[PDB]
Amino acid sequence: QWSGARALEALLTVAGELRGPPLQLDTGQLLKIAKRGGVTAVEAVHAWRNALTGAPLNLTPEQVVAIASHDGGKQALETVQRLLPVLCQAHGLTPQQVVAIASHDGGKQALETVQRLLPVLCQAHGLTPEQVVAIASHDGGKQALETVQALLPVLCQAHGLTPEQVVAIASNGGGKQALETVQRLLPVLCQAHGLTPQQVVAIASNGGGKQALETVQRLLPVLCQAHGLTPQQVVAIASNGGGKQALETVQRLLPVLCQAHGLTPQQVVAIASNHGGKQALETVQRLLPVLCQAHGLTPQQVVAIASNGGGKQALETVQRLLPVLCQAHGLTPQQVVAIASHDGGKQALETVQRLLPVLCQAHGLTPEQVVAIASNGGGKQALETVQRLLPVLCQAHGLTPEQVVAIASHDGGKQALETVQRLLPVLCQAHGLTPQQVVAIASNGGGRPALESIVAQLSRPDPALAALTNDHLVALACLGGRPALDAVKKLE
DNA sequence: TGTCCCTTTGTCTCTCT
DNA sequence: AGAGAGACAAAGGGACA
Ligand SMILES: [Mg+2]
C-alpha cells in the first residue's frame, strides 16, 4: 500500500472537525494549510483550535490559517501563543505585527529572534521596532536579524550605506545572503563599474538579492560591450525583479527578439525589468508570431502586454481569450490589450470574462466601465469589489454608480472602495466633508491611506495641521495623498 | 518527515513627481 | 498618470536532523 494513505486519512479526519467550531474552514483554507504546513500543521491547528480563537489571544480564523500555512506552522502556532503577549507588552508590538512575523516558514525562529534581539537593535543600533518587524517578516527572518545586528556597523561605516538601506536590503527572503553579498561586492561594483551604492542597494533589494548582484558583476562586461547595453539598462533589469534569471535571459534573447521581430533594445529591457522577466522574454519569442499573425495584434501591443510583471501569464491568457472576449463579449482587440497591459493581466482578463455580463446585466454598468476598472494593476480585485460593494455604496451611502466606478478605477481600487464604505460616515456625518470630497480623495492611487490620514487629522488633530481648513486638507489629500499630508505634518 | 532557509514568479498596492 | 518602488504570497529546491 502507498505510504501516504494513513497520513492522508488522518488529514481528512482532523480536517472535518475543523469545519466545526470555532474556525469553520472552507476547503480552500484546509487545502492551503495542508499543502504548506502539512498534516502536523493541520493537527496542530485542531489541538489549539480554542486557545488561539478567543481570550486570551483572540485571533481570527484568517489569522490562524495565515500562521499555520507555512513549513513549521505547528511550531509557529505554538510559539505565537507563547510569545504574542510577551511581545505586545514587553516590546509594544500590535498583535497584527506578531501575526506578520509568524506567517512565514520558520516563524518560530523569527519570533524568538525578535524577542531576543529587538532591544539590542533599537537601543544599540538605533532601529525602530517597525524596522525590526519588517526585517523579521520574511522567510529566514531570524537569519536576516542576526546578520543586520552583525553587519550594520561595517555596512554603514566601511561602506557608506545608511541604516535605511541596510534595512531595505535585509527586508526580503534571503536577506542574510543579500547583506553578505552587498558587503563583498559593493566596492567591486562601484569602483570597477561605476555604480552608485544606491544602484547596488536597488539591485540587492529584491529576493534573489545575492543572485542578482553576482549576475550583474559577472555579466555587466559581457552585456555592455558585446551586447550594446548601458550600465543603466543592466542595473534596471537587475533591480526590477528579474534579477539573475532576467539578466541571463537578456544575454540569450536580446538578439533573437530584435533580429527576428525588429524590437529595439529598450523594448527588451522593459520586458526584462519585472518579476519573471525571463519568462516574459521567452514567452515573447515563442508567442509573438502567433499573436501578430494574419494582421493580428501589432508587435508594439505584444511588447506592451509583455512589459509588466506576469507578462508571460498575460501573453498566454490573451492568446487564449482574445477570441472569446471579442466574439462573445463584444470587446475590441484594443480593449483586450489594455486590460492585459498591467501586472496581473491574466487575472483581470479572466475576471472580465467572468464578470462583464454580471456587471452589465445585474448592476447596469457599460462594458467600457468594466474595461476601465479592469485596466489597472489589481484589476481582478477592483472588479470583484465593485460587484460586492456597488449596491451598498449606492443605496446605503448615496454614491452614484459613476462615482463608484471612478473610485474603483485606479491601482488599489479595492482598498479605496472598502475604505470609502467604512470611512464615509465619520467623514461626512461627523466632520462635514461632502460625499464628493470623499469620492475625490479616494479617486487616486493611494486612495486608502489618503482617506485614513485625513481621518487621523480630524479625529486626533496634530497641531501641525491646524492652520489648514478641512477644504485645504481635502485639497492636499487629493493632490499628493498621505505623503502630502505627512509632508505638512513635518512643518510644526 | 518536519523544519528552516533561499530563489523565482506572479500579483497587488502605493509613491513620486 | 506612467514609471518606479514596495508589499504580500505560492511553490519548489537545498540542507539537516
Ligand atoms: Mg519543501
Numbering used by the authors: 231 to 722
Original authors' sentences:
Transcription activator-like (TAL) effectors specifically bind to double stranded (ds) DNA through a central domain of tandem repeats. Each TAL effector (TALE) repeat comprises 33–35 amino acids and recognizes one specific DNA base through a highly variable residue at a fixed position in the repeat. The crystal structures of TAL effector (TALE) proteins bound to their respective target DNAs have revealed that the residue at position 13 is the only one directly involved in DNA base recognition, whereas the 12th residue stabilizes the proper loop conformation. dHax3, an engineered TALE protein, proved to be a useful scaffold for structural characterizations. We then present fifteen crystal structures of engineered dHax3 variants in complex with target DNA molecules, which elucidate the structural basis for the recognition of bases adenine (A) and guanine (G) by reported or uncharacterized TALE codes.
When the natural TALE codes were discovered, no code was found highly specific for base G. In light of the structures of the DNA-binding zinc finger proteins where positive charged amino acids such as Arg, His, Lys play a critical role in the coordination of base G, we made a dHax3 variant with an Arg34, His34, Lys34 in the 7th repeat. We then attempted to co-crystallize these proteins with a modified dHax3 box element whose 7th base is changed from A to G. Four complex structures were determined at high resolutions. Nevertheless, an independent study showed that Gln34 is highly specific for base G, but not for base A. Therefore, Gln34 may be a good code that can discriminate G from A. It was shown that His34 is a strong code for base G, but not for base A. The structures shown here provide the molecular basis for the distinctive recognition of G and A by His34. Notably, the newly determined structures reported in this manuscript show that His34 forms H-bond with base G, but not with base A, which consolidates the genetic observation that His34 is a strong and specific code for base G. The structures also suggest that Gln34 and Asn34 are both strong codes for base G. Gln34, highly specific for base G, was not reported before and should be further exploited. Nevertheless, the discriminative binding of A and G by Asn34 or His34 unveiled by the structures provide unprecedented clarity to understand the biochemical observations. His34/Gln34 → G and Asp34 → C can be used as strong codes.
